[PDB]
């Protein structure tokens, strides 16, 4: 399921000397819990279309406790179309391996 | 066995006397100012006691978690991925204790830094220059409640499968592996704000798939310093794992 | 300045005016600095270049 | 104006400008098309000394390790050019071979 | 945590190598090449280590 | 600093520059114990923190109620 | 010798060598010169009009 | 010329033609030593160089001092 170009956006943001702290605080804040990521959906939908349109990367690919609620609790547009694709391949492939 | 610092963890009729849960932040209304006397009354270098969520038996599984960790992400970074821990009880210190969110004069839906000072939120929010709105924020303090102590390491040591239950030493028959438990992994921080993140986190290399020199060498400045005072510890295989760990 | 003094010569300025812009080339002048000494040939033997 | 008039980018020359248009300014203040190309300048220039380390052994002889030896990149005998920050009084006192 | 991470990196000098971290950036022939002994004998077993 | 994160940059006394505020009188009925005057003052701004916390989502569960049928089609009768 | 002091945070010499003696006269194919600068000279052009 | 920079083609005398400044007053005060008159006015010139650049950056940190909390705060209860 995983195309070459979506590796081309995930080692990016492995190797951005820019990358945002506060993707941190959140994910600190979060700690991976169903009913407070419902809390900041809000929130975390801004900061990854403030962090596409800067650049060509893609944010919170830190841990599986948010990439998971992005995919299967959005289902929206909040995230633009084209990095929302990115998301769903992730999970496209890891459903696949298992 | 879980080895929960000194003491261990044998049965699950023990599960109270060692492990700690919090449920949902609504069914938690009463007990709630409870939470908070734990924070500063109790001593968290020998609390012995652990911090998670409920578990869902019907929500997750854990190859679908094991394949994110161990397979995906090593290859796609390289292995540039360093444990971090999370000084939490300072985190909220930021983001309550502003000024533009204290005040309620100040309009909910405005942006932030029309309003916020000379700090680390101007300086945090100048990293991703997001605009929030002030209720975004607002709710960010609300997870203040709910949330957990200082990030705490507990190794697991399991007996092997009887296919393997052949060693030398009586030891040799169990093999172990470390959780961290309400840490979370990481890239390299920009070294823009590294002032900042050091006013927040602090790594904890402790997992051969995590324990990378040249991420923790952002993390905080003494282990910049070890990487330029011996040069032989910039690669993810050499690099020293404290044996506490 | 004084050519017969330093760790680069005459011939890699040599080198460097007729290059060409292939990425290649880039990896040509780094495994260029390879310093020709005795300790170093231990390094180049073990992984055969 | 210069990436938007002609299709070339400027600040090429120098290190510093090169370096810190990577970490600060990550704002659309200078646009997309032009920050990728700055950021494949130094996301390809740490990943040579990565494989420079690959060649260098894990091994030391005495207080100097064999990285210090092998390469020219590494050694720290050999300065960059150009000096803003005074690299002088660090190579006193870290080098055993008499500056 | 964070004082375990800084009772053992504090004042460190000398770094050690395991035995098994010094065999994995080895390449296929010079832990067959005889001059290597201490990474060539413990090498005993296909399963074990 | 060995065993603690370094101390964050923040501007110092929130309660003497706005309030006008009712927790700030919740701030005070925290006692001072055995604890130092500037021990004390690091403790109450803790204190603020946990408050201002449980204010806000108490003011956000009102918020996410949901709309109402009988106020709502009243309204609408006009 | 007036230069600004070193900190040891910003300080990269494998990464600045990599740049100015491998891939800037490369790139340039060996078209670089060392420029020289007055500067109040500087500013008397840029402030005092 | 061949051991100095060629000399800028700038108008000349500005201080005849706005001031007004108190700083111009402050060129004054420089002594003039044993230069002579034209030299006077060169060295004259490169004074109030500094002295620009001085009263640009003390008004600079006055500019990224930030905003503050109390007297913002007061004038938002309007």
Request: hydrophobic residues 40%; contains cysteine.
């Given at each position: 399921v995983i195309d070459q170009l979506t590796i081309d956006v995930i080692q990016?943001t492995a190797?951005?000397?820019?990358?945002?702290?506060?993707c941190?605080?959140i994910e600190?804040?979060i700690?991976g819990q169903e009913?407070?990521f419902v809390?900041?959906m809000?929130?975390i939908a801004?900061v990854i279309?403030?962090y596409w349109?800067?650049?060509?990367k893609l944010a919170f690919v830190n841990s599986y406790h948010m990439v998971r609620f992005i995919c299967t609790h959005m289902g929206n547009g909040s995230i633009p179309k084209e990095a929302h694709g990115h998301y769903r391949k992730i999970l496209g492939e890891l459903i696949a391996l298992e | 066995?879980?080895?929960?610092?000194?003491?261990?963890?044998?049965?699950?009729?023990?599960?109270?006397?060692?492990?700690?849960?919090?449920?949902?932040?609504?069914?938690?209304?009463?007990?709630?100012?409870?939470?908070?006397?734990?924070?500063?009354?109790?001593?968290?270098?020998?609390?012995?006691?652990?911090?998670?969520?409920?578990?869902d038996?019907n929500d997750y599984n854990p190859v679908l978690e094991k394949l994110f960790y161990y397979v995906l992400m090593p290859v796609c970074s390289?292995?540039?991925m360093?444990?971090?821990?999370?000084?939490?009880?300072?985190?909220?210190?930021?983001?309550?204790?502003?000024?533009?969110?204290?005040?309620?004069?100040?309009?909910?839906?405005?942006?932030?830094?029309?309003?916020?000072?000379?700090?680390?939120?101007?300086?945090?929010?100048?990293?991703?220059?997001?605009?929030?709105?002030?209720?975004?924020?607002?709710?960010?303090?609300?997870?203040?409640?709910?949330?957990?102590?200082?990030?705490?390491?507990?190794?697991?040591?399991?007996?092997?499968?009887?296919?393997?239950?052949?060693?030398?030493?009586?030891?040799?028959?169990?093999?172990?592996?470390?959780?961290?438990?309400?840490?979370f992994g990481?890239?390299?921080?920009?070294?823009?704000?590294?002032?900042?993140?050091?006013?927040?986190?602090?790594?904890?290399?402790?997992?051969?798939?995590?324990?990378?020199?040249?991420?923790?060498?952002?993390?905080?400045?003494?282990?910049?310093?070890?990487?330029?005072?011996?040069?032989?510890?910039?690669?993810?295989?050499?690099?020293?794992?404290?044996?506490?760990? | 300045?004084?050519?017969?003094?330093?760790?680069?010569?005459?011939?890699?300025?040599?080198?460097?005016?007729?290059?060409?812009?292939?990425?290649?080339?880039?990896?040509?002048?780094?495994?260029?600095?390879?310093?020709?000494?005795?300790?170093?040939?231990?390094?180049?033997?073990?992984?055969?270049? | 104006?210069?990436?938007?008039?002609?299709?070339?980018?400027?600040?090429?020359?120098?290190?510093?400008?090169?370096?810190?248009?990577?970490?600060?300014?990550?704002?659309?203040?200078?646009?997309?098309?032009?920050?990728?190309?700055?950021?494949?300048?130094?996301?390809?220039?740490?990943?040579?000394?990565?494989?420079?380390?690959?060649?260098?052994?894990?091994?030391?002889?005495?207080?100097?390790?064999?990285?210090?030896?092998?390469?020219?990149?590494?050694?720290?005998?050999?300065?960059?050019?150009?000096?803003?920050?005074?690299?002088?009084?660090?190579?006193?006192?870290?080098?055993?071979?008499?500056? | 945590?964070?004082?375990?991470?800084?009772?053992?990196?504090?004042?460190?000098?000398?770094?050690?190598?395991?035995?098994?971290?010094?065999?994995?950036?080895?390449?296929?022939?010079?832990?067959?090449?005889?001059?290597?002994?201490?990474?060539?004998?413990?090498?005993?077993?296909?399963?074990?280590? | 600093?060995?065993?603690?994160?370094?101390?964050?940059?923040?501007?110092?006394?929130?309660?003497?520059?706005?309030?006008?505020?009712?927790?700030?009188?919740?701030?005070?009925?925290?006692?001072?114990?055995?604890?130092?005057?500037?021990?004390?003052?690091?403790?109450?701004?803790?204190?603020?923190?946990?408050?201002?916390?449980?204010?806000?989502?108490?003011?956000?569960?009102?918020?996410?109620?949901?709309?109402?049928?009988?106020?709502?089609?009243?309204?609408?009768?006009?």
């Amino acid at each position: 399921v995983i195309d070459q170009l979506t590796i081309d956006v995930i080692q990016e943001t492995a190797f951005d000397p820019a990358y945002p702290l506060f993707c941190y605080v959140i994910e600190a804040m979060i700690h991976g819990q169903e009913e407070k990521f419902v809390m900041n959906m809000p929130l975390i939908a801004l900061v990854i279309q403030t962090y596409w349109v800067n650049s060509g990367k893609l944010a919170f690919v830190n841990s599986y406790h948010m990439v998971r609620f992005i995919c299967t609790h959005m289902g929206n547009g909040s995230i633009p179309k084209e990095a929302h694709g990115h998301y769903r391949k992730i999970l496209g492939e890891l459903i696949a391996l298992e | 066995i879980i080895k929960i610092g000194d003491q261990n963890y044998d049965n699950p009729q023990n599960r109270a006397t060692f492990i700690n849960l919090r449920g949902r932040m609504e069914d938690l209304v009463n007990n709630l100012v409870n939470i908070y006397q734990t924070r500063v009354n109790e001593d968290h270098d020998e609390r012995h006691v652990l911090d998670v969520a409920p578990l869902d038996e019907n929500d997750y599984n854990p190859v679908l978690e094991k394949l994110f960790y161990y397979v995906l992400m090593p290859v796609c970074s390289n292995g540039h991925m360093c444990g971090m821990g999370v000084d939490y009880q300072n985190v909220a210190l930021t983001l309550t204790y502003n000024g533009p969110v204290f005040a309620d004069v100040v309009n909910a839906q405005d942006d932030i830094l029309l309003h916020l000072e000379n700090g680390t939120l101007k300086d945090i929010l100048q990293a991703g220059d997001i605009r929030p709105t002030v209720d975004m924020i607002r709710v960010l303090c609300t997870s203040f409640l709910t949330c957990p102590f200082v990030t705490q390491a507990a190794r697991v040591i399991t007996k092997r499968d009887p296919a393997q239950s052949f060693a030398t030493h009586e030891y040799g028959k169990d093999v172990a592996q470390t959780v961290l438990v309400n840490g979370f992994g990481a890239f390299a921080v920009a070294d823009r704000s590294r002032e900042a993140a050091e006013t927040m986190f602090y790594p904890v290399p402790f997992n051969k798939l995590y324990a990378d020199p040249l991420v923790a060498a952002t993390l905080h400045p003494l282990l910049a310093n070890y990487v330029t005072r011996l040069p032989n510890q910039r690669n993810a295989v050499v690099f020293n794992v404290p044996s506490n760990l | 300045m004084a050519e017969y003094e330093e760790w680069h010569k005459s011939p890699v300025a040599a080198y460097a005016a007729s290059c060409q812009a292939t990425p290649g080339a880039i990896s040509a002048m780094v495994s260029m600095h390879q310093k020709l000494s005795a300790p170093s040939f231990i390094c180049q033997a073990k992984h055969r270049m | 104006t210069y990436w938007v008039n002609s299709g070339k980018l400027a600040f090429v020359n120098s290190y510093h400008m090169v370096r810190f248009i990577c970490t600060h300014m990550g704002n659309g203040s200078i646009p997309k098309e032009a920050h990728g190309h700055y950021r494949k300048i130094l996301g390809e220039l740490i990943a040579l000394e990565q494989a420079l380390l690959k060649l260098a052994g894990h091994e030391t002889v005495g207080r100097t390790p064999i990285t210090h030896l092998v390469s020219a990149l590494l050694d720290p005998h050999l300065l960059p050019p150009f000096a803003y920050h005074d690299v002088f009084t660090d190579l006193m006192q870290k080098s055993s071979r008499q500056p | 945590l964070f004082r375990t991470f800084h009772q053992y990196y504090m004042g460190k000098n000398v770094a050690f190598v395991p035995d098994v971290a010094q065999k994995a950036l080895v390449t296929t022939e010079d832990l067959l090449h005889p001059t290597s002994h201490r990474l060539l004998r413990l090498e005993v077993h296909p399963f074990f280590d | 600093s060995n065993f603690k994160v370094r101390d964050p940059v923040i501007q110092e006394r929130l309660d003497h520059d706005y309030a006008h505020h009712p927790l700030v009188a919740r701030m005070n009925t925290l006692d001072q114990g055995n604890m130092s005057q500037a021990e004390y003052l690091v403790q109450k701004r803790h204190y603020l923190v946990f408050l201002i916390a449980h204010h806000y989502y108490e003011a956000y569960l009102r918020r996410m109620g949901g709309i109402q049928r009988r106020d709502h089609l009243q309204t609408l009768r006009d």
